[PDB]
Amino acid sequence: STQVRGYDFNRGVNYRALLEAFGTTGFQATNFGRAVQQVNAMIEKKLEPLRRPLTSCTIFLGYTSNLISSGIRETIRYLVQHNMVDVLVTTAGGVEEDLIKCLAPTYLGEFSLRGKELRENGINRIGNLLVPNENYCKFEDWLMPILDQMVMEQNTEGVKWTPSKMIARLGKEINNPESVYYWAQKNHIPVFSPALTDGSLGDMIFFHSYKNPGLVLDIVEDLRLINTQAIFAKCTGMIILGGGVVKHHIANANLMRNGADYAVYINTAQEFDGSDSGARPDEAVSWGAIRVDAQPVKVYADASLVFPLLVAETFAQKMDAFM
Amino acid sequence: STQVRGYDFNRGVNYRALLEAFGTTGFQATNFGRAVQQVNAMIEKKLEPLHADLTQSRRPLTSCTIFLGYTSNLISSGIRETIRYLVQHNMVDVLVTTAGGVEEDLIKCLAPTYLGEFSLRGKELRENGINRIGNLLVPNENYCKFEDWLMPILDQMVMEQNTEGVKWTPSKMIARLGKEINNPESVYYWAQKNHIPVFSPALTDGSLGDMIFFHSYKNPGLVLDIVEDLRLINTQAIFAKCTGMIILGGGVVKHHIANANLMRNGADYAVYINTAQEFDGSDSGARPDEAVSWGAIRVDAQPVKVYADASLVFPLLVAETFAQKMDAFM
Amino acid sequence: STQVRGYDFNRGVNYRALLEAFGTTGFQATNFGRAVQQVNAMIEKKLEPLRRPLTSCTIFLGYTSNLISSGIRETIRYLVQHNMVDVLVTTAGGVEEDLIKCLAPTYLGEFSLRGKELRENGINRIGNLLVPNENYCKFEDWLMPILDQMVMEQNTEGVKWTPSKMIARLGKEINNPESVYYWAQKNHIPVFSPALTDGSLGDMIFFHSYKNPGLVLDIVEDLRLINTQAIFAKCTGMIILGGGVVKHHIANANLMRNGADYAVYINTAQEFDGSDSGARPDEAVSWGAIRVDAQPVKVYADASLVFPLLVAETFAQKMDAFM
Amino acid sequence: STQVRGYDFNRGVNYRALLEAFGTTGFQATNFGRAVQQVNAMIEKKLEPLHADLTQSRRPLTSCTIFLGYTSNLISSGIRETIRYLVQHNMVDVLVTTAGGVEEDLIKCLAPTYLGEFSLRGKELRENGINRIGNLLVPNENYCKFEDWLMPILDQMVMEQNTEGVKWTPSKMIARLGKEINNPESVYYWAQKNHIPVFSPALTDGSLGDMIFFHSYKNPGLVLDIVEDLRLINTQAIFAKCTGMIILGGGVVKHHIANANLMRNGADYAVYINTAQEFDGSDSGARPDEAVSWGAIRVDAQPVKVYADASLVFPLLVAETFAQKMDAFM
Ligand SMILES: NC(=O)c1ccc[n+]([C@@H]2O[C@H](COP(=O)([O-])OP(=O)(O)OC[C@H]3O[C@@H](n4cnc5c(N)ncnc54)[C@H](O)[C@@H]3O)[C@@H](O)[C@H]2O)c1
Ligand SMILES: NC(=O)c1ccc[n+]([C@@H]2O[C@H](COP(=O)([O-])OP(=O)(O)OC[C@H]3O[C@@H](n4cnc5c(N)ncnc54)[C@H](O)[C@@H]3O)[C@@H](O)[C@H]2O)c1
Ligand SMILES: NC(=O)c1ccc[n+]([C@@H]2O[C@H](COP(=O)([O-])OP(=O)(O)OC[C@H]3O[C@@H](n4cnc5c(N)ncnc54)[C@H](O)[C@@H]3O)[C@@H](O)[C@H]2O)c1
Ligand SMILES: NC(=O)c1ccc[n+]([C@@H]2O[C@H](COP(=O)([O-])OP(=O)(O)OC[C@H]3O[C@@H](n4cnc5c(N)ncnc54)[C@H](O)[C@@H]3O)[C@@H](O)[C@H]2O)c1
């Protein structure tokens, strides 16, 4: 039986102690402390001895596209750079905006900026962030020569493209250590995104296809690829930021092994609308995506606040072991 | 300037007058009244009197092309019946849903979904072979029946691909599954009959994916291309005279419809019903005015969002719009 | 075991049947159907044979202030006019805006209107509603003579004012059948509002007190009055729109009888922040405010949408019995 | 124009740099950075160098009067320690909380609150005499201890009212209870010692109300007037040089502080941390810009709202603001 007690600033600002005190502070601070424990359990299992080498715990990291628009892009890049996770799942924006950020920056704005004035100035709004139209022109100039080569390799070298194979290629092409997908392909970390056409990359494929028709992106082979990552794992953990396709696709892969061993959700969705996004971890227990003997954790919060704190208290403390 | 005033039950109970009074009641009731107005504006344009090679589609053009999107769980709910009615009577032109929203319409033709409670514990449900969807329950046997029904169809699809040159995409598969289920309770039966295409770019994310996966180890070779389906949905928008978007929930379904309409520099009419909030920067939670900034909604449109569970609001919306104009659609 | 099935509009628009189909539609539509059943159980008990006459079920109706700004003001007035509920609990805005609406209307606006331009034009925003400053000037001119008389009656006739006694007096003074509190005092329905100073009525008492000091509003006697309404009831029901003080004050009164027999919440709050507003009915079971054998219902929705539908399917169908 | 960029853990773990990077991370992380800026602006003004009969208060004026409001459940949480620290060191000037936020600070001096889970079932908890507050647990015996401690104090308050002319209000009672608990872990012990008034107009809505209720049948006569407490809080705003509002959660606490500041035609600085959303028309969920329309926030202020559980955000906020300036407050 653990008593509720917050951090006492009469001790001064001891940041490690302040973060540890979230566990006994209550409400979502306590869930944060539980999430730290669950992620550290994943890492401790992964470091147990037994293209990418198998480890004792396969960690799936999922995130919605807007988190790549945000500075959480740097947090994810760090984990991928140091081989701390094994499989990435994101929607199409979460692919393309990592690449675009290597060509031009995203800027801070406000949620309340009016769409008319923004559109008239060629500025696209993402929450309280701003992406100029010119960023996508740069993307077009960068991407079209690659699409030309991909069609050629398909038609003359027999290549059968899927979203994950295209994402590996785009990461190699961007050739920039600030990029998540640069590090992912270098470290043989696959990236799944079954609706890769739903964004700017789709715009480009669409326009490209009228001049150079025929590109195929098969989602069936990529379903086999993600499901086998779960089926042949010794143990699995899921770390899922946000909801939607990213959350369900990781969960359903883990259903194929009768459930993940560890799971942490950070998302703002609520259960009352019946949505998969808002479903509690215990819903996933009913269908076998989380094992009955797991102790999963959900933190109800904007991941832009919580995820850097979580990484500080887990992966970043064990960096030595990942090098 | 319109005064706030609620329905007066000293009039008795006239349900049409009750629903009309939402407009002057305030908060999301007022947004509901605005949504009724926007959908009726879409319908009135669609009925104005007024291609096939450009869209690579057999569906005849009308004066307003309406895109209807909905998340998968709304097909688990009774909103499945609401959507089926609109598709049955050719009241909308394009559907977008995620994979669950396809498969559970078909499964409901084989076995029912049941009422439960949100608080039922996962361990006991799992031990009893019952899967929870919010406060709904789907027995494992429903998926066994689905497997028995679907596996021969997947055999035929592979055979047609390898010897008749068929290049499958999600929308082409969904049309075939609707034809095979051959049941007037099914949304996708009516969609294929009425030449209403269904887009679902992540069609592998669900039970149909499970089945395709297992089937492929018995019968390898099925391919599902998402590139041609992007061409097909975008051309529905580009060659429209006018467009409206009616979007229930968020995620891929909402963005995919919005991005198609960006290709024509924006939708003319738009109604969102969803529970998501903007503060997390999500596309699901973004206000319609965010979409104006990137060109998916025209600057001169008057879009409407209702912040509510669509299981409550969507049947009322249909009652006051499409269902009132049924004669014009017959 | 009940199957999920929505209303089939191939039947045409049969509104009663459409509303009944919410019960088998799922998610919050099913909770709406459950709420109809729970309220009808309250009413059926109330109509069982055994200043205000006691009945077989005492119904407490609570609502946040903004719902009186809204057109739900008419819905509440109707229930109170016909003696369909027994105790009202609202915050201070929910008192004063009913009275002000008898002097001048509230108007429809938009949530996005900018505060600076509104303030410069003397327009106050309440959500997507608008109240001109002039409405409060009218209120001042109307109320100040009443405050003069209340101070006189306190100092010369021994009156000990409480919020509920002031609300009865204000209802008698407004003398207008459009007003909730006019009907409440006429029908001997008490109104509790322990923080009655938190709003425009407070502004007025404050300004009045410098010219005519001494008015006392005791909250202790009003605590005895609301608690005795629960303690001596045969059965109780709670119908609570929104959260905050209104929700807890009704619940805590019912804890004094070891719990309400029936309970329906309609509110938009979520549990994750630990708030009383967002707590599920089952939290209230732990502390004894809802009986262990009750079957309470929460609908997660804006009450401006749901409450008129709920009344249509419950109280309004039994109007004959209330006359 | 500032670029989006998150903290780079290739630097290692420097927690101050990590928190500073929230400003350029986006979404509510960016709002957190803006909140740090606004609170530090309040503090810097308060420390500028620079009545008693007008405010009927013994507290000396500073260059910025800071109002701190918080909902009751945050005193059930460990944020009680965070608030106590600010009050102990005279860093804020006025407190507003609901009744639970008073009584549970006192009860925690008698017995602890424990960690639990949101999903614990009410029937089993009730049968075991345990009350649930979110994912926290308070045994019934805590309230028994509270009763034993409080009843003699209520006896003295009635006696002082009837023979020494005392006219009790919530704030006067809260000062007395803080003096009686005589324990440096208590928020209200420090508030009365430092002449920080606490307003709680619905002080009867909770366990203190229960106790006053039962006590009154043994010892009739206690009166609690809310009119004088309205005069007292409003005069704190009217006679301020500058004001800031720091408001955790919504409800009465948020409006009561805002309405006091309306009396001076608006607060100069304002930070909200709350989880409520605007769509339901609620005051809790209203954006700061709503308060600009009615005059509670000055038109030239730059208020900030962070959409988050304060149990997560408030300790971080204090770490980067008040706790950095501790020396100036000593
Ligand atoms: N930057 C963009 O948002 C962007 C860009 C291009 C395309 N798109 C497309 O939009 C579609 C829908 O986007 P999506 O599925 O990535 O998610 P989404 O933005 O729709 O969010 C889904 C849910 O995830 C949760 N979530 C979102 N942001 C969160 C946060 N900061 N913290 C915690 N939880 C959070 C919320 O509950 C939200 O409702 C995708 O197909 C995507 O490619 C979006
Ligand atoms: N029945 C199921 O939920 C189910 C079944 C199989 C697979 N999946 C998979 O889960 C993935 C994610 O599901 P999704 O993208 O369809 O949506 P989702 O369930 O993740 O919902 C996305 C957002 O839509 C909004 N929404 C959901 N239900 C709503 C309602 N009742 N009223 C209003 N707004 C509502 C909410 O803001 C929610 O966060 C999909 O790829 C899907 O195939 C789900
Ligand atoms: N019109 C006004 O809002 C107004 C006017 C004058 C004074 N005030 C003062 O503001 C203070 C706080 O207001 P309050 O306690 O009445 O509530 P509130 O507006 O703070 O709402 C409390 C909670 O109730 C729920 N709620 C609100 N509106 C809802 C709706 N439409 N449907 C469902 N749930 C809903 C929400 O979860 C919300 O967070 C009170 O003391 C009041 O006197 C407000
Ligand atoms: N511990 C308790 O909760 C408790 C104890 C005794 C009595 N009560 C009574 O309940 C009544 C209502 O409680 P209240 O008005 O203090 O608030 P509440 O708990 O009703 O919360 C009001 C709103 O504040 C916001 N909020 C709450 N917790 C938050 C958090 N962790 N982070 C951010 N925002 C948050 C939310 O939007 C919430 O809807 C009061 O009269 C009180 O005395 C409660």
Numbering used by the authors:
A (entry chain B), C (entry chain B): 28 to 77, 91 to 363
B (entry chain A), D (entry chain A): 28 to 77, 84 to 363
Q: Which passages does the manuscript contain on this structure?
A:
Hypusination is a unique post-translational modification of the eukaryotic translation factor 5A (eIF5A) that is essential for overcoming ribosome stalling at polyproline sequence stretches. DHS catalyzes the transfer of the 4-aminobutyl moiety from SPD to the modifiable lysine (Lys50) of eIF5A in a NAD-dependent manner.
Simultaneously, within DHS, the rearranged position of Trp327 would collide with Lys329, which was mutated to alanine in the trapped complex used in our structural studies. It was therefore plausible that this conformational change was a direct or indirect result of the K329A mutation, rather than eIF5A binding per se. To address this issue, we determined the crystal structure of DHSK329A in complex with NAD and SPD and refined it at 1.6 Å. DHSK329A crystallized in the P3221 space group with one tightly associated DHS dimer per asymmetric unit. In detail, we found the perpendicular position that is also found in the eIF5A-DHS complex and the position that is parallel to the bound SPD molecule, as in DHSwt (without protein ligand).
